């Protein structure tokens, strides 16, 4: 009620300090009386006293020995002081659960990918420890996945809330409860465990539940069953999308899902074979644990395609060769291995086919391995979902206002992440186009170094046989020096065919030097005009508005909790409702007019510039190979200049 | 069913509990516009009484109400409180509090971060100037009355506030003192007194401490304080009585604990030393102060990192400034001359055109800098930080003491934690630089071998002229004479070129990936991002911070209830446990590995400059051969 204490001989807690209200028990924040440390206390209701206590504490001992991260620690079983009944002393996770985590508006459309992999890593490692200690757990939900801050800062998710007549005189209606007790037991077949796990993973990935009838999954109790027991093999989500219209299946993550394409490629097949009605084609734990832990042991290399203007996470094993790296890059970019040029920190990147992934250059999302083709490729862009504000109910409703506020915060929150990615795409494009231009400079500079090596061996052979005409026709027979000879006069005209046709190699190579020059025809002048920039501060401008909308939303929650407001406080709440819509719209249209429009203008100026640069690299290649054709042409003619 | 906690005007209301400020003449409450609900700060003069008739300070307020400038907090209206008729000024509410509450955070115990500092400097100077333009200055600018607003773009906007706008033969000898003489020697000091306060504020913002301290705190020792600010040598900006009643330690530089860039310190220390000067002349004037500071603010900043000193650098340069002064500015901090500065940007070498404007330099950030290295030998300096240790935590239960103790401790672990982060940057940058330098030398190698082979197909081709089956059986005029001396040099040129290739290969085997200049120490020694050392520290710093914030609350209560007392006593042990763990982690893991990486880079640098000398000698050797063969190429 208020200022009420329960205690054991070793802990105490306030009934008001309640963390968790379940049907069988309640959990409280408590302290160890002598040290002051914080523990959670699980105290059981009056209806949890319906199975013997000899086998109830049999369950609890076998749990008190479970020692493992990803499992909340059970420290002791003690007895309350005044009343005498059993309480569990557990590990206190002050950060709450994955449920409170998904309840934030930042995770309104799914967790960020780095955190998802942790939920995945930790939930799978928890189940495995439970399966190994002979414990089934089918109630795995965000509600009872706890979150702890590990001492390195990254989250650690931990599992919890798991356990360890005479027939011939019966009325035929009551005889049906004497045959559906052993026969209606459509026995579970051990693959039931990971249906929850699969729903949880979809929830954490997308911010929404996988199977949803319109009006909610709970208001429409019946259409729910039609969806679960009718989902095609491989389908991942079923949504009504209509007041009462047909249901819409899909085996893909929603567009709103921001996880990398690489990861969805790994993740969808897992969920597809984890959500399955029969035991035969549905996965077993041996296969689930083996297939998932394969995703966990992969490292991530960030590559960015300049031709496409698209980022890519490459999920690859530490022991995989450079060959599989190229394949994985092809699977996302449609650029074949023999067409992949890698650029890293300004210089090209050669992969020796024996090189292992662990020895690759370290990458971050903002320091990626760029990949470009010499062939033509159309720019794709960042594929995101176009989300706009919900309609604002003019009713003064404290429940409805808090819900509308959560939604608006989550939409502006999404626009704010997207706008951030749009700036990275533009900033990475600029970082890459800059280097690509400098690599065509190395390619041009190499061609000139070879040309000025062949132009001087061509010359030392021409004046080497022309100076024998200075002795054959000037000092001896003195006649017209024009009549042709047999053997050498055919290789003399063949050399003049090289020296003169190479003169027009310079006139075209000089043109490509000029268009590749700084103020030239291929300058990256669009890159410094056509986008948004870090100095525009569009992200933090949005953030500033999102902070106001968020501050209102948190308040509208406290208003809902207070259930009904005083007079001045009601007018402020009403005033702040208009303020919230003002800020949201100010943000959403700024997302449209400043972030998106200037990004699209930049995306299109890069498709123009991309065609231009590909053409030039094709010309410079055509000229480079002529220098090797003139290289071998003088190779067979030079040793003939022996005398 | 009772009132007396709600004041109002005809247009605003406020709760006497929502008090934002207290002062001798008035208080300031957070209030609302009755018709619109918008928040304003309302200042209510409950003791307006002074030596100043109300008509003087009322014409003042009408003057301030016209002010409209981004660094003044707007005075919207002058109103009368509904029931007491007290004058109330309603004005713009800055929910972020003041520069005082900012400098009170433990993360600013040792000065503001540079970016924020520049903002305070810009806006304080901006408001100050707008005041002069309207014929007001107060000499009373201090953090207490500089408000902070979050701008549309999320950057702070500081705003000035709380400034005004405008017998005898029958008396004792001790009354004749002050009645006709001593209260008459008020020399109405002006013009230069104003800046002293702004100087102390900027020092305080920049270091997190006050510039003049008599060991007992400026307030508890009233006397020594006056002895400091009146005997301060010209050019000094801080005087501190280090020990109990010791001499005063004068200094004219920032303290090591000051995280401000060496570039900005060089600009700031002058405008402090000339602002904190206690005479009519020798001190600066407004017009010079505004121009001199305006010079710092109109400067852009280019980031450069010295691979050989292992130090980062901010270069405060004008956009119209020429590349030649960029080198000057790098010389001032690096002590390496302009003819010695090789510049590297994004994996490639940078060419300072000697005349290009800084406006057109490549964009840089603290982590994407321009690197600088020379061919000459340089000793690694590393980050200069101050080594700050946890204070002594005394074991008594004292609510005032423990609050003061937790604040100090939180501050030390922020400095530790921030310093730990910079150490990681210097290593991550160092590695990016070494990697890039090694590839540049590979370009200087490939450039040399490209001309070595370019010249051998001239030696072997011009030897095939004067030394083939064409040149040179009894003969006496068949060329065996003065041309045979050139064929001799050309033979010793082709043979000496032999051992050029032998030494040229030897350096390729050290530039190779496995060779004895491979940057293998770089990925073994020192700390890495994957080590998560900063966020490890951060996790402890959050425990410590949460406790300090609760110990503030306890101090406020002055008396803790029974259980709370005991929890507070346990949290004080937790606080000391977290802090000593964070501190020893900073020492034995961040610093210890950083220094190991530092010494491994000094050793690897010696090997690098020794190879670059050699490769150079081989390059010059080829231009020599090109020179000496381009002479004999032209024969007759």
């Amino acid at each position: 009620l208020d200022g009420i204490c329960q205690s054991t001989s070793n802990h105490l807690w306030l009934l008001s300090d309640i963390l968790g209200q379940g049907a069988t028990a309640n959990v409280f924040r408590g302290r160890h009386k002598k040290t002051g440390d914080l523990y959670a206390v699980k105290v059981f209701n009056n209806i949890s006293f319906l199975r013997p206590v000899d086998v109830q504490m049999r369950e609890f001992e076998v749990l008190k020995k479970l020692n493992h991260k990803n499992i909340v620690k059970l420290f002791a079983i003690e007895e309350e002081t005044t009343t005498r009944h059993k309480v569990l002393i557990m590990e206190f996770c002050p950060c709450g659960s994955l449920y409170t985590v998904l309840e934030e508006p930042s995770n309104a459309y799914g967790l960020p990918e780095s955190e998802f992999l942790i939920v995945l890593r930790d939930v799978v490692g928890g189940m495995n420890h439970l399966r190994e200690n002979g414990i089934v757990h089918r109630d795995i939900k965000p509600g009872n996945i706890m979150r702890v801050i590990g001492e390195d800062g990254q989250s650690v998710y931990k599992l919890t809330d798991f356990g360890a007549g005479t027939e011939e005189y019966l009325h035929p209606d009551m005889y049906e409860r004497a045959v559906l007790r052993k026969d209606h037991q459509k026995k579970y077949g051990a693959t039931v465990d990971l249906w929850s796990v699969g729903v949880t993973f979809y929830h954490a990935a997308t911010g929404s539940l996988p199977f949803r009838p319109f009006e909610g999954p709970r208001r429409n109790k019946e259409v729910m069953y039609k969806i679960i027991t009718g989902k095609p093999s491989g389908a991942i989500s079923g949504v009504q999308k209509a007041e009462n219209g047909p249901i819409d299946w899909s085996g893909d993550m929603p567009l709103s899902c921001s996880l990398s394409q690489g990861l969805q490629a790994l993740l969808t097949p897992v969920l597809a074979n984890i959500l399955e009605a029969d035991q035969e084609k549905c996965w077993g734990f041996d296969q689930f644990f083996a297939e998932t832990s394969d995703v966990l042991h992969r490292m991530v290399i960030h590559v960015f395609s300049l031709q496409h203007m698209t980022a890519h996470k490459i999920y690859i094993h530490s022991y995989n060769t450079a060959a599989v790296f190229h394949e994985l890059v092809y699977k996302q970019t449609k650029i074949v291995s023999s067409n992949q040029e890698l650029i890293y920190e300004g210089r090209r990147l050669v992969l020796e086919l024996g090189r292992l992934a662990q020895h690759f250059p370290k990458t971050t999302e903002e320091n990626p391995i760029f990949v470009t083709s010499r062939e033509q490729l159309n720019t794709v862009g960042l594929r995101y979902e176009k989300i706009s504000l919900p309609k604002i109910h003019p009713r003064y409703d404290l429940d409805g206002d808090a819900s509308m506020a959560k939604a608006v915060t989550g939409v502006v929150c999404y626009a704010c992440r997207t706008a951030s990615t749009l700036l990275l795409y533009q900033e990475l494009m600029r970082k890459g186009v800059r280097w690509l231009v400098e690599l065509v400079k190395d390619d041009y500079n190499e061609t000139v170094h070879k040309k000025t090596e062949v132009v001087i061996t061509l010359d030392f052979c021409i004046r080497n046989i022309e100076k024998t005409v200075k002795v054959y026709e000037k000092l001896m027979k003195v006649n017209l020096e024009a009549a042709e000879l047999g053997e050498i006069s055919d290789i003399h005209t063949k050399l003049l065919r090289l020296s003169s046709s190479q003169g027009t190699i310079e006139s075209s190579l000089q043109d490509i030097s000029s268009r590749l020059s700084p103020g030239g025809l291929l300058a990256d002048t669009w890159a410094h005009q056509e986008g948004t920039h870090p100095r525009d501060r569009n992200v933090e401008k949005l953030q500033v508005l999102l902070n106001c909308i968020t501050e209102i939303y948190y308040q509208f929650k406290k208003d809902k909790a207070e259930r009904r407001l005083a007079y001045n406080e009601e007018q402020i709440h009403k005033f702040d409702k208009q303020k919230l819509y003002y800020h949201a719209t100010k943000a959403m249209s700024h997302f449209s007019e400043e972030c998106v429009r200037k990004y699209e203008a930049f995306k299109d100026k890069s498709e123009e510039w991309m065609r231009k640069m590909l053409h030039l690299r094709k010309q410079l290649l055509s000229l480079t190979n002529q220098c090797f054709d003139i290289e071998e042409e003088v190779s067979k003619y030079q040793d003939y200049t022996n005398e | 069913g009772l009132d007396g906690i709600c004041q109002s005007t005809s247009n605003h209301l406020w709760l006497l509990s929502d008090i934002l400020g207290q002062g001798a003449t008035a208080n300031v409450f957070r209030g609302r516009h009755k018709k619109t609900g918008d928040l304003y700060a309302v200042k209510v003069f409950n003791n307006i009484s002074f030596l100043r008739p109300v008509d003087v300070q009322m014409r003042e307020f009408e003057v301030l109400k016209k002010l409209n400038h981004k660094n003044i907090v707007k005075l919207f209206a002058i109103e009368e409180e509904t029931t007491t008729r007290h004058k109330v000024l309603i004005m713009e509410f800055c929910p972020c509090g003041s520069l005082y509450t900012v400098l009170e955070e433990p993360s600013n115990a040792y000065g503001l971060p540079e970016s924020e500092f520049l903002i305070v400097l810009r806006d304080v100077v901006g408001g100050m100037n707008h005041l002069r333009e309207n014929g007001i200055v107060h000499r009373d600018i201090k953090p207490g009355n500089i408000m902070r607003v979050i701008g549309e773009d999320g950057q702070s906007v500081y705003k000035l506030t709380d400034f005004g706008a405008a017998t005898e033969e029958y008396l004792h000898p001790d009354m004749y003192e002050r009645a006709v003489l001593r209260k008459d020697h008020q020399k109405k000091y002006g013009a230069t007194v104003d800046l002293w306060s702004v100087g102390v504020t900027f020092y305080h913002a920049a270091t997190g401490s006050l510039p003049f301290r008599p060991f007992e705190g400026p307030r508890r020792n009233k006397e020594v304080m006056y002895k400091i600010i009146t005997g301060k040598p010209s050019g000094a900006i801080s005087g501190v009585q280090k020990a109990e009643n010791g001499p005063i330690d004068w200094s004219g530089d920032m303290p090591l604990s000051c995280s401000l860039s060496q570039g900005l310190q060089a600009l700031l220390t002058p405008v402090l030393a000339n602002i904190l000067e206690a005479d009519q002349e020798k001190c600066w004037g407004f017009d010079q102060f505004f121009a001199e500071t305006s010079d710092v603010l109109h400067r852009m900043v280019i980031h450069v990192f010295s691979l050989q000193h292992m130090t980062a650098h901010k270069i405060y340069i004008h956009s119209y400034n020429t590349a030649a002064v960029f080198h000057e500015l790098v010389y001032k901090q690096t002590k390496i001359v302009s003819s010695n500065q090789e510049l590297i940007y994004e994996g490639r070498r940078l060419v300072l055109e000697l005349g290009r404007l800084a406006q057109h330099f490549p964009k840089t950030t603290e982590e994407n800098p321009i690197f600088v290295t020379s061919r000459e030998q340089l000793n690694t300096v590393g980050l200069r930080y101050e080594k700050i240790s946890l204070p002594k935590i005394h074991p008594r239960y004292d609510l005032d003491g423990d609050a003061s103790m937790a604040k100090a401790v939180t501050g030390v672990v922020c400095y530790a934690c921030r310093t730990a982060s910079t150490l990681l940057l210097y290593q991550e940058l160092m590695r990016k630089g070494v990697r890039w330098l090694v590839e540049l030398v590979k370009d200087d190698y490939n450039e040399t071998v490209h001309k070595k082979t370019e010249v051998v197909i001239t030696l072997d081709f011009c030897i095939r002229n004067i030394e083939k089956t064409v040149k040179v059986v009894n003969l006496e005029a068949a060329e065996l004479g003065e041309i045979s001396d050139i064929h001799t040099k050309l033979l010793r040129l082709s043979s000496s070129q032999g051992t050029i290739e032998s030494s040229l290969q030897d350096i390729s085997s050290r530039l190779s990936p496995g060779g004895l200049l491979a940057d293998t120490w770089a990925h073994q020694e020192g700390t890495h991002p994957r080590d998560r050392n900063v966020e490890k520290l951060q996790v402890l710093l959050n425990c410590i911070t949460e406790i300090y914030y609760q110990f503030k609350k306890d101090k406020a209560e002055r008396r803790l209830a029974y259980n709370e007392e005991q929890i507070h006593k346990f949290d004080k042990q937790k606080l000391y446990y977290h802090a000593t763990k964070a501190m020893s982690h900073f020492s034995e893991e961040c610093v210890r590995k950083y220094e190991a990486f530092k010494d491994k880079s000094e050793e690897w640098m010696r090997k690098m400059l020794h190879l670059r000398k050699q490769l150079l000698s081989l390059t010059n050797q080829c231009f020599d051969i090109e020179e000496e063969v381009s002479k004999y190429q032209d024969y007759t």
Partner: peptide, 14 residues
């Protein structure tokens, strides 16, 4: 460790 004075937390206050 050095900090002292810590008493056990109580439920009953007479």
């Amino acid at each position: 460790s050095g900090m002292e004075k810590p008493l056990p937390l109580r439920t009953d206050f007479s």
